[PDB]
Symmetry: D2
Subunit: 334 residues, 4 copies
């Protein structure tokens, strides 16, 4: 009995999740719901400006899409409760719309008949937050709604964990230079949420914006709670991002010690890089985070240290792969 | 007393229209209506990624914006009929939202109490269509709703006019390489109108798209009706465009004859250029169209001729300046 | 197995090594470039438009090891001194642009290479071949041929179909083209003197000349003198399309034209009906990809004007066409 | 009046001519670049990032006429061969980027120029000046000075305020910076061998080193050795910002920091409270523009980490600072 998945919101994250889940074993995507006709969804899945064509068969059947010979039901109801996840017997729902990133709203899928919900973004203090390779253990399968956190959280968390475990962290400020995203406008225009800076043209500007990945780091690594705060700078790349962390450490450290600590911590989720890469090189990586040893810097002024550690991540593909990893692990327990 | 104007849709065209109207004499903007809070509108009027900062004073008063010391009432009603144009005593309304681009929808402004309406886009066959400097004479002031046509039409019209008058046109195909616009998405995502190509990330792609500026050219130049059709290629420039016309002429022509005719036709609306300019040079021009003599090409094979003529235009500012010119001329007679 | 040497490890040369590694019966024995090997390895491994190389690439003393196989690296500016005979080289891809004529290219034959293919137009003494259009004109006796420009490989298959099926009186070509290295990053003086390539490539629509239309006679003789064209450079690092507005001898319908291109589809010439954009054409292996969605036939008083549009990745499509011509010329 | 020659009619050289025309008591007698006069005029008239030149520019035989005044044009790559002596040029603006040290700059003095100002860091033996911070150190006796890098002119006023009001223990600087000429249009070999500037400028976030922070000692001696930084080049043709995460000696609140920067405002150092973006800073005449919105103070256990951010137009902001240093240096010389 293979786990059944439905994807709510066939956006960048939802669509890439279908690509990765197809390769995954024990999981298949029974249905997708998005407020657009199925013809549009098929096109956007087949062709991709940043991630390349889907390496597989994609065809259109009436009210459905056939991916590699398997039909996937398509729905367009904006209200989650109305969706027939119960009639489909779906096990888990990927909440990728960005409008139901909270415990109560995610439960609407449970009312529709879905057993569990995983949110493709932060979901508040009431739901569990998981960065794979850091705190996947906390899941026991009993939770109805969990959150895979933000893309920046999946990039920062492994890097911050190593600094805390090996040297201890007093405090840190995080600056993430981030690719532009959907909430930004194509050209200067009114913004739905009221942000005067996302209202501005995404591809023309360095755009300051807030991010909570550092403050909310407490939900992933409790030992780091309250020690980090951060900001963001959105820049004209359609995908590909990096995370800088200026941190004060409890124990003194050398740039070689830090890089060696990260290399030991490398996993399927956390990569170690020594080449002189740039953002385009990170597009499509499956790591949730890619630590760049070249960017490590330790500065010592009068026996006082300030440390910069940097990790690349593809806000789209890196997060998606971490999302699928958390989805598989959550199925084993659930 | 001065002509009083209200702007519906404080978008790229609506906001630039406010800039040009301040400089214009005998015309002022009494109010703007947009489904945005005034705080956002003031900001987007003051700061511009492509057209530069507004050269003037702009401040926020309760439910209004004060531009150069003069109050402008701000409303946020999406339904045009509900706006109080009668109360404010508004001579003309600029329909710049892009959602009311036809005679019937535009009439909601007249119901609200506005005397006249000018549509910042094509409005079909039922309303008069005017490219200033080509057919403004057709207006007698009796019309309730008129259209300034598309930005592409204001570029194509003066160039095609010279060709028809001097050489005569059998037929022509138009290709306009056009800056990306709001109707395109920032990143691959479903599109509201269902266009699979405007759905694609605007800043990453050459995006073929339809344009009716060539077919509807009959409403501007009746002598050319049915003789032209064209398409568009949207490319990653935030503003600045050009229009090519490959045309068969009735009388034989040389490249020098064509350039001389266009220079003779030059006006405030139609410029003549001999420098080797590029798209960025056209940003902020006040001409509705700028003929590029350098790109003109006449090809003869066995006495059969094919002619290429090219003209630059800033889809935002060039169209906005033509829009104001038609707004004044229509206001003198209205 | 065909043994190939690449003179000039630029973007085309590097992508050619990627495509040749995938190809069976053909391998790259050596590359000669005056650039340091540490840099050449980096640009081979990492590509901003074409992505990471799907393979192993490491540097060993005086060579680079691609998928476990040594490839000799040389830095001699004089091709004749290179040991093409010792390595057993069959064909040379001349991608430097400095040996683009019969005599200079022959220096590779003196070095021991059997034949040479130039990745740019080659002059009045060498044959010009767009694979899938006129490879037949080769009789195997030639030492040096030219694969023409990337733009020629996009225009040629589409124009050949029009000439054979309907006949062409005349045509004008406009190619909306990705920006290229010769354009400056930011406004600055330009080496060749072009006031428009001097302008910042990623910020502008940049008119510029193209000779693909005039030279079409070398590929399709019956189209000689019937075509003229220009180019518009737009801010995409790769991916392009070619429009051709043409007057045809015989009347045609858009369905007739699209059906004809579909019949002409091959490994080199693709036929597309989806609503694609430039990013979708990046990395395609077709030399040209005809877009049926953009076809338009205009009739006004019995007089017709026809527009046909074909995509091509100026980098990869030309590279794959170059490899197709490279093997075919080695076999005859 | 003061006579100026521009060696290198690049982005900085051309913008310097625009600002120098507006300046009084200074005029540009000649420009030298390894380009034909036809090309130099075109690039002076038309600008993709800074807009068309608001003035008259025409071509005369071997010269360009800006606002009706002839400016002799030269194309000699060796400064020594240039005729600065015949032209009696008081100062030379070294904007090529190929003569950025005292020894190479002296070639202009051999050619007959009295003084040279380098539009970049010219080493730690030459006096280095950020206008509005340490212009006083110049007494006019120097033959070669440096106006420093664009990032230095952004960081210097902000760092000086922090040093005076709260004192600085140490700081790390990260500048998100517009791409520049030394980066390649498309992936290709790089002249200096930089594997990252070799990559296509408009497609990538490109880490790169910058010495603006370490050299801060030449501008603010009090800060010597306390700052180091790196840069991230991102795809904007112009417009930049500088972040500084710093440990302060005395505790501070974000409101205290913002108030201090506003008090320090001048023609060179601006204060901004709007939610601006990079395009908004294009064309500004400030050398640096402090963004109060971005200030942040992080206190964990009474241990403070402070972030201060300032925008700058790497082209125009530096050029206006360069002209300001040129005027002051011409009064003293
Ligand atoms: N892509 C990233 O950089 C990234 C990284 C991490 C997390 N996220 C999170 O992912 C979510 C959005 O992902 P994205 O940015 O790829 O999405 P997106 O911007 O492409 O749009 C989301 C999709 O959901 C659909 N949708 C909207 N409302 C809906 C509704 N009521 N019912 C059904 N479908 C609906 C939209 O049509 C669209 O197809 C957000 O929560 C965001 O924080 C995004
Ligand atoms: N931008 C150009 O190059 C250009 C050129 C010529 C014509 N136009 C025409 O101008 C119109 C809009 O142009 P744009 O691209 O600047 O628009 P835009 O993308 O800036 O947005 C239009 C504005 O209308 C507002 N709006 C939307 N629905 C509304 C409603 N119901 N009531 C009130 N306000 C509403 C939006 O909030 C926004 O401020 C379109 O019809 C377009 O065809 C644009
Ligand atoms: N561009 C910026 O944002 C910026 C900011 C601050 C400082 N600078 C400094 O200004 C200098 C140049 O910057 P840029 O980017 O404006 O330059 P640029 O890249 O536009 O070119 C400078 C000019 O110098 C010319 N040149 C080169 N070698 C020459 C020689 N031997 N003789 C004469 N002319 C020669 C070039 O042809 C070009 O016209 C560098 O020192 C740079 O660090 C630049
Ligand atoms: Na092989
Ligand atoms: Na002066």
């Amino acid at each position: 009995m293979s786990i059944k998945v439905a994807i709510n919101g066939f956006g960048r994250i939802g669509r890439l999740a279908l690509r990765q889940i197809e390769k995954a074993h024990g999981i298949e995507v029974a249905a997708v719901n998005d407020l657009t006709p199925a013809e549009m969804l098929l096109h956007l899945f087949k062709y991709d400006s940043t991630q390349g064509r889907f390496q597989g068969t994609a065809e259109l059947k009436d009210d459905a899409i056939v991916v590699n010979g398997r039909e996937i039901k398509v729905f367009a109801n904006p209200n989650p409760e109305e969706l027939p996840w119960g009639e489909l017997g779906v096990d888990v729902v990927l909440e990728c719309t960005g409008f139901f990133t909270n415990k109560t709203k995610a439960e609407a899928h449970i009312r529709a008949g879905a057993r569990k919900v995983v949110i493709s973004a932060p979901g508040g203090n009431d739901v569990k937050t998981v960065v794979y390779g850091v705190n996947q253990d906390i899941l026991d399968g009993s939770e109805t709604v969990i959150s895979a956190a933000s893309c920046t959280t999946n990039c920062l968390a492994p890097m911050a964990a190593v600094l805390q475990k090996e040297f201890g962290v007093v405090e840190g400020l995080m600056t993430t230079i981030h690719a532009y995203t959907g909430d930004q406008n194509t050209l200067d225009a009114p913004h739905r949420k009221g942000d005067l800076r996302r209202a501005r043209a995404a591809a023309l500007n360095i755009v300051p914006n807030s991010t909570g990945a550092a403050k909310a780091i407490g939900l992933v690594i409790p030992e780091l709670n309250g020690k980090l705060d951060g900001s963001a700078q959105r820049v004209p790349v359609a995908t590909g991002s990096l995370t800088e962390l200026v941190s004060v450490l409890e124990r003194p450290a050398t740039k070689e010690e830090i890089n060696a600590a990260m290399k030991a911590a490398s996993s399927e989720s956390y990569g170690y890089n020594e080449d002189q890469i740039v953002s385009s090189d990170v597009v499509g990586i499956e790591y949730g985070s890619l630590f760049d040893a070249t960017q490590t810097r330790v500065m010592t002024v009068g026996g006082k240290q300030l440390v910069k550690t940097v990790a690349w991540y593809d806000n789209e593909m890196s997060y998606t792969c971490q999302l699928v990893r958390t989805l598989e692990y959550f199925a084993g327990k659930i």
